[PDB]
Amino acid sequence: MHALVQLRGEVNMHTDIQDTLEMLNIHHVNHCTLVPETDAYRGMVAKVNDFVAFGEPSQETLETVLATRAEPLEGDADVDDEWVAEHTDYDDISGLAFALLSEETTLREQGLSPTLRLHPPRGGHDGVKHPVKEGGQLGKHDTEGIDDLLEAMR
Amino acid sequence: KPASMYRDIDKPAYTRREYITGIPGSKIAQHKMGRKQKDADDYPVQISLIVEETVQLRHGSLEASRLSANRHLIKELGEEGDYKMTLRKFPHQVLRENKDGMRAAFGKIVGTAARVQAGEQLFTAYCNVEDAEHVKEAFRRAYNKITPSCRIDSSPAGNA
Amino acid sequence: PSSNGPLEGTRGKLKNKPRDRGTSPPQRAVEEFDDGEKVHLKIDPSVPNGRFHPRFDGQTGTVEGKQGDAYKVDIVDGGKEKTIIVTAAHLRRQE
Amino acid sequence: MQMPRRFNTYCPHCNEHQEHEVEKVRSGRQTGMKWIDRQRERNSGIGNDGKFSKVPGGDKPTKKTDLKYRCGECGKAHLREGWRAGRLEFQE
Amino acid sequence: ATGPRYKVPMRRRREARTDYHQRLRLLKSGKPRLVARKSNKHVRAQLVTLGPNGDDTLASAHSSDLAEYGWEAPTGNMPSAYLTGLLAGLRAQEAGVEEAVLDIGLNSPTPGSKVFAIQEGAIDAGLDIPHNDDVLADWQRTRGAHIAEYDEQLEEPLYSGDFDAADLPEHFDELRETLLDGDIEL
RNA sequence: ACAGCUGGUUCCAAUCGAAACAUGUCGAAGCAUGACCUCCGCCGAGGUAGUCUGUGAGGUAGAGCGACCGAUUGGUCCUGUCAAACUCCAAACUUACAGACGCCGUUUGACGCGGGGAUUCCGGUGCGCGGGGUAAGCCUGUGUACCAGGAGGGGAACAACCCAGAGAUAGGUUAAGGUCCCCAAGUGUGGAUUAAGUGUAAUCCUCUGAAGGUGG
RNA sequence: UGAGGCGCCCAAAAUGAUCGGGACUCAAAUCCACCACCGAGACCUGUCCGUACCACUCAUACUGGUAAUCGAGUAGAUUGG
RNA sequence: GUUUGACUGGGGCGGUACGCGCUCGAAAAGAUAUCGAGCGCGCCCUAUGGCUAUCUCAGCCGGGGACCCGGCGAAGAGUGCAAGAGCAAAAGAUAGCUUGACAGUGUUCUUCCCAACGAGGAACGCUGACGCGAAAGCGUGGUCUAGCGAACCAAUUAGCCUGCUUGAUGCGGGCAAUUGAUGACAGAAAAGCUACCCUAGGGAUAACAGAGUCGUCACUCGCAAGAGCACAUAUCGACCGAGUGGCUUGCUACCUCGAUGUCGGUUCCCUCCAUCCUGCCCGUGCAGAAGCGGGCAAGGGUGAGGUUGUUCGCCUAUUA
RNA sequence: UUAGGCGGCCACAGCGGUGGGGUUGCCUCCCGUACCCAUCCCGAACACGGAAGAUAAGCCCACCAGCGUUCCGGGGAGUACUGGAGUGCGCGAGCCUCUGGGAAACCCGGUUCGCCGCCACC
Ligand SMILES: [Cl-]
Ligand SMILES: [Cl-]
Ligand SMILES: [Cl-]
Ligand SMILES: [Cl-]
Ligand SMILES: [Cl-]
Ligand SMILES: [Cl-]
Ligand SMILES: [K+]
Ligand SMILES: [Mg+2]
Ligand SMILES: [Mg+2]
Ligand SMILES: [Mg+2]
Ligand SMILES: [Mg+2]
Ligand SMILES: [Mg+2]
Ligand SMILES: [Mg+2]
Ligand SMILES: [Mg+2]
Ligand SMILES: [Mg+2]
Ligand SMILES: [Mg+2]
Ligand SMILES: [Mg+2]
Ligand SMILES: [Mg+2]
Ligand SMILES: [Mg+2]
Ligand SMILES: [Mg+2]
Ligand SMILES: [Mg+2]
Ligand SMILES: [Mg+2]
Ligand SMILES: [Mg+2]
Ligand SMILES: [Mg+2]
Ligand SMILES: [Mg+2]
Ligand SMILES: [Mg+2]
Ligand SMILES: [Mg+2]
Ligand SMILES: [Mg+2]
Ligand SMILES: [Mg+2]
Ligand SMILES: [Mg+2]
Ligand SMILES: [Mg+2]
Ligand SMILES: [Mg+2]
Ligand code: NA
Ligand code: NA
Ligand code: NA
Ligand code: NA
Ligand code: NA
Ligand code: NA
Ligand code: NA
Ligand code: NA
Ligand code: NA
Ligand code: NA
Ligand code: NA
Ligand code: NA
Ligand code: NA
Ligand code: NA
Ligand code: NA
Ligand code: NA
Ligand code: NA
Ligand code: NA
Ligand code: NA
Ligand code: NA
Ligand code: NA
Ligand SMILES: [Sr+2]
Ligand SMILES: [Sr+2]
Ligand SMILES: [Sr+2]
Ligand SMILES: [Sr+2]
Ligand SMILES: [Sr+2]
Ligand SMILES: [Sr+2]
Ligand SMILES: [Sr+2]
Ligand SMILES: [Sr+2]
Ligand SMILES: [Sr+2]
Ligand SMILES: [Sr+2]
Ligand SMILES: [Sr+2]
Ligand SMILES: [Sr+2]
Ligand SMILES: [Sr+2]
Ligand SMILES: [Sr+2]
Ligand SMILES: [Sr+2]
Ligand SMILES: [Sr+2]
Ligand SMILES: [Sr+2]
Ligand SMILES: [Sr+2]
Ligand SMILES: [Sr+2]
Ligand SMILES: [Sr+2]
Ligand SMILES: [Sr+2]
Ligand SMILES: [Sr+2]
Ligand SMILES: [Sr+2]
Ligand SMILES: [Sr+2]
Ligand SMILES: [Sr+2]
């Protein structure tokens, strides 16, 4: 399971690439979604590779982001362990995080919006003109690299 | 006519003689110099002139450089010296010139040039350890008459 | 294009690979397809008659009946539905 | 090109193949009593006469065949599309 | 053979065994094919149908299995050819086959020949086959009369082994009689 | 008088939102029919902008030609070269159909169908691929995003380069870009090179700097 | 004797020189890394408005609900004032 | 009284990219432009059409550029004509026979990718009648893609409908289709001048000038063959290669057509240096005098006259 | 399939070569022209009639790789080329990095001297 965050805006990006992001439920910069590692999904992230940051987050990090940015399919009801327990097939955020990372369920299945609307990266990110290996923030990240980014955008 | 007009590969390959007429003759006198009855294998030293940039070289330039190169080898090793040099490229690319404004501008045929990719050997000589510095000096003169910068690379020759 | 005839720009698609040259095997010229069957359209260079417009080479239509020995194949050209008359010789079952 | 004066072919009248004779269509003579003839006299006067002031058009490099096919047994003829032919000579 | 661009004919063509152009025309009927073939000593009739991985023979008869019904005579002649077609035909009727088109392969459409006898035989068995009566040898020749009269110009028995001296087209009748009959064990 | 030509045509707001192309035209400063925009009605469950897989289509890049074809060296098999109108080979990729996943649709009715109303048929730029031309802020294609009709931030200024698509108002954090002063943020850290004020200039009509040479 | 980095020569134009300017030389240059910051209407967040849709309704009157998947616009189409 | 067309790196001239077909341009589905590259069609053929039987071609080798025999030979032959493509017990050849190059009426695709549009074309059916073949089957012309033409009118083919109260006769009107042309080829019947001019507009489009470009022009540099009696480099300097300028010329059509007045000259002011003189230098094929070449250098100077509107230039006497 | 017929794929099947196989069986070569039929002349072929001989052809079985072809390994080569992205480099033609794909020639070693279907048959 990979966490996907759009880091580059829609202006001037190929339409078929913008549509791909929308099919992955991301319609804004800094919006994040969790995608199963399938051959079908793999082609999609590969196509959006130059306008996004992605990788597999750690259990803890996922839990931090879910607690802080997860939302109900509809409504403003805050999502905490109690919400999780009283609305999902899990006991608390941790149980959800584990099931997601192991690809057993999806935010939608559990009555949660497929998107995590993150905050701008505190302290800024590594730039959107170069990939990770070159010192930028675009492309596939380390579990640690992805964790660093997601946390800065908690 | 300046080479700036043709040195670049900015046009389709234009070589088909079945669809092109009036092609001027090449000014290249010879492609094999020195003792052509002998093999390049029979020599201890082999030095080539390598073109550093991809370019087109008009037959007029190939002849000037080759001439000034071989000319030196003859003056230093003799009109029969024990050496052999080869110009391995041939001017297959036909060139035009639009010599009436931009209307129906397809140019008339005015010459030929050889396309050379960077890193390729334009010339290659084979000599004896003695005349090694003479072939190197012939190439110094040759590359001064062709567009790109060149490398004078020594192939077989561990007599440094 | 310099001209607009039906065979304009068909040098490649209507020429046989050297070894496929010569009269083609009769088996496929006699093949029978059922209505609804998906069939790929591809003119056989060696078979003169029963061809469709070269522009349709590569389509994968649906047999929706026949006319004489030829088959009526349904396709969608861009956004427009068209019916193509074609003999088995220029058809192949899909999958 | 050459054309046989007679040959077997379909007679749309007998409704079966029979021998026919081919003949070039000869122009029939006009009477001068058709409506168009009366219209020209009525509509022509002082000055220009519209369509009636126009003169004969040109010619095509080659004309199409213009023949009659007459059934050798029922005597009736039928027409057919013609085909461009520089010259048409009958054999026999 | 010569190189990459060399064109080798289909196998059955190299072997000079199948006329593919005639085959195509044959298959265009949609009907089964009465495959008539002949050897120096024997004659074979097969009812073939088209198939995914190759042809399908639905019924057949060889001149050899003729003795099986009382034939002590040779097998490379007219009476043999006819009766062989009739047997194959009868068996064809058994398997459900009702019509056919004559496929004489690389043999010639010679009037009165054996491939045509095989066809008249198959037709009499009740099979519907597009044909032409005046291309078939006349009844007597089918019976084997032409060979009887030949043995008439005797002086030395036509047949080596002794099946008979002046031969017997009447034997043809017996066998045909035996086949047209129902009892027969096809 | 007529004009297919120039000018002008007066109040507020809300929803959607082009075409600068195709066919025909005494047609190219105009029209009509399409494409595309919009409105209304009908229909009733699927649809397909993305990806993967399967079954097919293709000969461009590259490569090669003791594989055709036609060019193109020398020596007494070898040895030297090529192709827009060559191909024994052969991609990336584009493309037909189907399944799967995704997204979407069944009160927001999708897809499709019928009808009313148009505007439009001088386009431009960047990038990729081009063809012509010495070249051009040149001419003429093609795919795409942008300007046109796109604010706001940056780029000295600056239609289309970068960030960015934007209801009002407010707090906060970033983006591009920047942190010696002009001007918000470093006269930041570890280290090396440069002595020419080289340089302090992503892109560019706009920022030059070449062949050649250098015991700096 | 080979290779690499920066620089030097090659290097001429018309009203007043220029990296935007000042001006900068163990840099305020260049290259390799790193640290901390500034900086939009973007993104996050409070309230309100419009619009679409939903529930209730005679209502397109109130009231309540949903919008991560609504909010720029020339020609033009549609509608309330 | 009118017409005298359109396209076009402005227009005219030239040309036709004004109706069609092929290869390439075209970027591996389809579509795709330029006065883009190569080149064709406006017919021809009663067989050079159709079927059947028999058969296998270029070319080369061996035996007696004509003939005969044998071997090799997937296709280089032939197939009317461009090109690309198709074809070998054939789509080619020979022989024989035949008239399907047939009548009626459709489906579909094309014309016109997508996406509406006529004529024309093609593939594929049904019905009728036929040809050849044993039969399957083949034949809706020539292996495939060019060889084409609306309405009105006329002539023609076969049958039928109809013409003003009514009957007969004459002569008309009509249903279906064939042929006759509009090549400006989706169709007007059609020549020029205007400096005597006029209007509407256009920087949608030219002339001067600006701007871009720099082939041209000017100037420079690299290499240095060659000669300079010997001697590359005192001096002259081919070939080829690399540049700078924006004085010449060309190209483009970006600005300007509700006007930015032209060439030359004159007068008056500022500037550039690639320097003609003057200052200071280096070399010399530098004795001197003087030449010749080179370097720094833009302070100052660079004048008067003859022809010609001339710029430029040719010419004269002065001049550092 | 101890030798046959009809095929599908259409060289992995071609080219060339070696070895083996047939008394009433099979296929052939083979013998022979009264008939059906036949040769612009030839019973050569086509057609018909038939068994004295033969396994020399063909054919079938076993096999060989030199040429041609198919596929595979290792090398060439993750090279050439390339879809997406970049305030990366270069005076510039052009190049580079990240991401996703990925040849061809040729060399060397294997594979390939057909596979499969239906029917009939000591
Ligand atoms: Cl079609
Ligand atoms: Cl006539
Ligand atoms: Cl046989
Ligand atoms: Cl927007
Ligand atoms: Cl300074
Ligand atoms: Cl209001
Ligand atoms: K003006
Ligand atoms: Mg929500
Ligand atoms: Mg940054
Ligand atoms: Mg092509
Ligand atoms: Mg308003
Ligand atoms: Mg309102
Ligand atoms: Mg290439
Ligand atoms: Mg506008
Ligand atoms: Mg400050
Ligand atoms: Mg400077
Ligand atoms: Mg900040
Ligand atoms: Mg008038
Ligand atoms: Mg005009
Ligand atoms: Mg194409
Ligand atoms: Mg008329
Ligand atoms: Mg007439
Ligand atoms: Mg027209
Ligand atoms: Mg047209
Ligand atoms: Mg006026
Ligand atoms: Mg303007
Ligand atoms: Mg203009
Ligand atoms: Mg100076
Ligand atoms: Mg002196
Ligand atoms: Mg001065
Ligand atoms: Mg043997
Ligand atoms: Mg740069
Ligand atoms: Na074929
Ligand atoms: Na009148
Ligand atoms: Na008027
Ligand atoms: Na336009
Ligand atoms: Na127009
Ligand atoms: Na107009
Ligand atoms: Na679906
Ligand atoms: Na390329
Ligand atoms: Na826009
Ligand atoms: Na600004
Ligand atoms: Na400076
Ligand atoms: Na509007
Ligand atoms: Na006119
Ligand atoms: Na002209
Ligand atoms: Na039509
Ligand atoms: Na100029
Ligand atoms: Na210049
Ligand atoms: Na003046
Ligand atoms: Na001065
Ligand atoms: Na004078
Ligand atoms: Na044998
Ligand atoms: Sr070019
Ligand atoms: Sr050079
Ligand atoms: Sr009158
Ligand atoms: Sr008159
Ligand atoms: Sr004429
Ligand atoms: Sr909108
Ligand atoms: Sr393409
Ligand atoms: Sr500092
Ligand atoms: Sr430092
Ligand atoms: Sr400018
Ligand atoms: Sr630059
Ligand atoms: Sr340099
Ligand atoms: Sr709004
Ligand atoms: Sr709006
Ligand atoms: Sr002009
Ligand atoms: Sr035909
Ligand atoms: Sr005149
Ligand atoms: Sr005058
Ligand atoms: Sr003005
Ligand atoms: Sr100076
Ligand atoms: Sr002086
Ligand atoms: Sr003069
Ligand atoms: Sr014999
Ligand atoms: Sr340059
Ligand atoms: Sr791979």
**Contact residues for A124 (Cβ-Cβ < 8 A; gap 6+):** none
Contact between A84 and A95 under an 8 Å Cβ cutoff? The reply is yes
Closest CA to E77 of E173, E179, E145: E145
| CB of B37 within 7 Å of some strand F atom | yes
Helix (H, G, I), strand (E, B) or coil at D11: strand
- Residue-by-residue DSSP string for E110-131: -TT-HHHHHHHHHHHTT-B---
Tokens of E80: 């043999």
Tokens of B141: 């003169």
Tokens of A42: 């793999």
CA angle C38, C43, C45 (to 5 degrees): 150
List bases, strand G, within 7 Å of protein CB: 1, 3, 34, 36-39, 42-46, 65-69
The architecture in CATH of the region A58-113 reads Orthogonal Bundle (1.10)
Any chain E CB within 8 A of the CB of C26? yes
Identity of the residue in E7, E9, E50 whose CB atom sits nearest the CB atom of C18: E7
How far apart are the two ends of chain E, measured CA to CA in Å? 48
Closest CA to B4 of B64, B59, B55: B55
Kindly provide the residue ranges of all beta strands, DSSP E only, lying in C1-95, ordered along the sequence: 38-41, 60-67, 70-77, 80-86, 91-93
CA distance E130 to chain C (A): 20
CA distance linking residue A13 with residue A19, whole number of Å? 10
The nucleotide minimizing the C1' distance to residue A29's CA is G43
Contact between E173 and E181 under an 8 Å Cβ cutoff? The reply is no
Contact between A113 and A66 under an 8 Å Cβ cutoff? The reply is no
The nucleotide minimizing the C1' distance to residue B160's CA is G1
User: What's the DSSP call for residue D27?
Assistant: P
C21–E10 CB contact, under 8 Å: no
User: What's the DSSP call for residue E128?
Assistant: B
**Contact residues for D92 (Cβ-Cβ < 8 A; gap 6+):** D4, D5, D6
What domains sit in chain C, N to C, each tagged with a CATH number? 1-95 (2.30.30.70)
Tokens of A131: 């990939």
Q: Is A127 left (phi over 0), alpha (psi -120 to 50) or beta?
A: left
Cα–Cα distances (Å) from E9 to A97, B125, C20, E18, in that order, read: 67, 52, 10, 11
**Contact residues for A78 (Cβ-Cβ < 8 A; gap 6+):** none
Domain borders along chain A are 1-57+114-154, 58-113
C18–E4 CB contact, under 8 Å: yes
The dihedral sign for the CA sequence B152, B153, B156, B158: positive
Domain borders along chain E are 1-186
How far apart are the two ends of chain D, measured CA to CA in Å? 14
CA distance linking residue D59 with residue D65, whole number of Å? 15
Helix (H, G, I), strand (E, B) or coil at E105: coil
Q: Is C72 left (phi over 0), alpha (psi -120 to 50) or beta?
A: beta
CA distance linking residue A77 with residue D91, whole number of Å? 102
Tokens of B157: 């020759």
CA distance linking residue E99 with residue E89, whole number of Å? 10
CA distance linking residue D38 with residue D32, whole number of Å? 8
Helices B59-77, B132-142: inter-axial angle, 10-degree rounding = 150
Tokens of B155: 């192939």
- Residue-by-residue DSSP string for A47-107: HSTTSEEEEPPPHHHHHHHHHHH--BSSS-----HHHHHHHSSSSSHHHHHHHHHTTS--T
- Which experimental method was this entry solved with? X-ray
Tokens of E108: 């010639």
The CB density around residue E118, as the number of other CB atoms within 10 Å, is 31
Closest CA to C45 of C78, C69, C22, C72: C22
**Residue D14 annotated in ligand binding:** yes
| Strand-strand pairing, C38-41 and C60-67 | antiparallel
Closest CA to A59 of A147, A134, A128: A147
Tokens of B99: 């010599």
Taking the CA of residue D60 and the C1' sugar atom of nucleotide H144, their distance in angstroms comes to 28
The architecture in CATH of the region A1-57+114-154 reads 2-Layer Sandwich (3.30)
Any chain E CB within 8 A of the CB of C68? no
**Residue D83 annotated in ligand binding:** no
The nucleotide minimizing the C1' distance to residue A31's CA is G68
CA distance linking residue C90 with residue E34, whole number of Å? 28
CA angle A67, A69, A72 (to 5 degrees): 90
The CB density around residue E170, as the number of other CB atoms within 10 Å, is 10
User: What's the DSSP call for residue E132?
Assistant: -
| Strand-strand pairing, A52-55 and A139-140 | parallel
E32: exposed, middle or buried (C-beta count within 10 Å: 0-12, 13-18, 19+)? buried
CA distance linking residue E135 with residue B31, whole number of Å? 78
Tokens of E90: 């009868």
Any chain C CB within 8 A of the CB of E56? no
CA distance linking residue E169 with residue E149, whole number of Å? 11
Residue type at B42 in one-letter notation:
D
Identity of the residue in E4, E7, E27 whose CB atom sits nearest the CB atom of C30: E27
CA distance linking residue C13 with residue B6, whole number of Å? 37
In CATH terms, the fold of domain E1-186 is Nucleotidyltransferase; domain 5 (3.30.420)
| CB of C42 within 7 Å of some strand F atom | yes
CA distance linking residue C55 with residue B56, whole number of Å? 40
CA distance linking residue E93 with residue E127, whole number of Å? 7
Helices A59-69, A93-101: inter-axial angle, 10-degree rounding = 120
| Residue A54, φ and ψ in degrees, nearest 5 | -150, 160
The CB density around residue A78, as the number of other CB atoms within 10 Å, is 11
**Contact residues for A127 (Cβ-Cβ < 8 A; gap 6+):** A135, A136, A137
Closest CA to E34 of E51, E21, E49, E24: E49
Q: Which residues of E touch C26 (CB under 8 A)?
A: 20, 23-24, 27
| CB of B94 within 7 Å of some strand F atom | no
Contact between C40 and C52 under an 8 Å Cβ cutoff? The reply is no
Q: Which residues of E touch C69 (CB under 8 A)?
A: 28
CA distance linking residue E151 with residue E166, whole number of Å? 5
List bases, strand F, within 7 Å of protein CB: 49-60, 67-68, 70-76, 80-86, 88-89, 95-98, 100-103, 112, 130-136, 138-139, 144-146, 162-165, 172-177, 211-213
Compute, in angstroms, the gap from residue C20 CA to the centroid of ligand 33: 5
CA distance linking residue A129 with residue A135, whole number of Å? 10
CA distance linking residue E157 with residue E146, whole number of Å? 15
* SS3 readout for B111-136: EEEEEECCCCEEEEEEECCCCHHHHH
Closest CA to B85 of B120, B136, B129, B51: B136
Compute, in angstroms, the gap from residue E28 CA to the centroid of ligand 72: 84
Helix (H, G, I), strand (E, B) or coil at B47: strand
Closest CA to A24 of A40, A8, A12, A9: A40
CA angle E123, E129, E130 (to 5 degrees): 130
Residue of C nearest to E5 (CA): C18
Taking the CA of residue A16 and the C1' sugar atom of nucleotide H224, their distance in angstroms comes to 62
Any chain E CB within 8 A of the CB of C18? yes
Tokens of B41: 């294998």
Strand G-proximal protein residues, Cβ less than 7 Å: A 9, 22, 25, 27-31, 71, 73-76, 113-115, 117-120, 123-124, 135; B 151, 160
CA distance linking residue B55 with residue D85, whole number of Å? 59
The dihedral sign for the CA sequence B90, B92, B93, B97: positive
What domains sit in chain D, N to C, each tagged with a CATH number? 1-92 (3.10.450.80)
Residues present in chain D in total? 92
Helix (H, G, I), strand (E, B) or coil at C57: coil
**Contact residues for E9 (Cβ-Cβ < 8 A; gap 6+):** C22
- Residue-by-residue DSSP string for A119-153: PP-TT--S-SSSBGGGTSSBEE--HHHHHHHHHHT
Taking the CA of residue C29 and the C1' sugar atom of nucleotide H78, their distance in angstroms comes to 27
Residue whose structure tokens are 């009946």: C65
* SS3 readout for E11-69: HHHHCCCCCHHHHHHHHCCCCCEEEEEECCCCEEEEEEECCCCCCEEEEEEECHHHHHH
Residue whose structure tokens are 């790929």: C40
Output the furthest CA–CA distance in chain D (Å, rounded): 58
Tokens of E179: 């086949």
Residue type at B24 in one-letter notation:
P
CA angle D47, D48, D54 (to 5 degrees): 150
Whether chain A lies against chain E with 3 or more Cβ pairs closer than 8 A is: no
Tokens of B27: 């000014």
Q: Is A81 left (phi over 0), alpha (psi -120 to 50) or beta?
A: alpha
Helix (H, G, I), strand (E, B) or coil at C20: helix
**Contact residues for A97 (Cβ-Cβ < 8 A; gap 6+):** A59, A62, A63, A66
List bases, strand I, within 7 Å of protein CB: 4-11, 13-15, 24, 26-30, 34-38, 46-52, 67-70, 83-88, 92-94, 97-100, 114-121
Cα torsion at A35, A140, A146, A86 (round to 10°)? 0
The dihedral sign for the CA sequence E109, E111, E117, E119: positive
Helix (H, G, I), strand (E, B) or coil at E93: helix
Compute, in angstroms, the gap from residue C64 CA to the centroid of ligand 6: 58
**Residue D74 annotated in ligand binding:** yes
What domains sit in chain B, N to C, each tagged with a CATH number? 1-160 (3.90.1170.10)
Identity of the residue in E4, E7, E24 whose CB atom sits nearest the CB atom of C26: E24
CA distance linking residue E60 with residue A118, whole number of Å? 81
Helix (H, G, I), strand (E, B) or coil at D62: coil
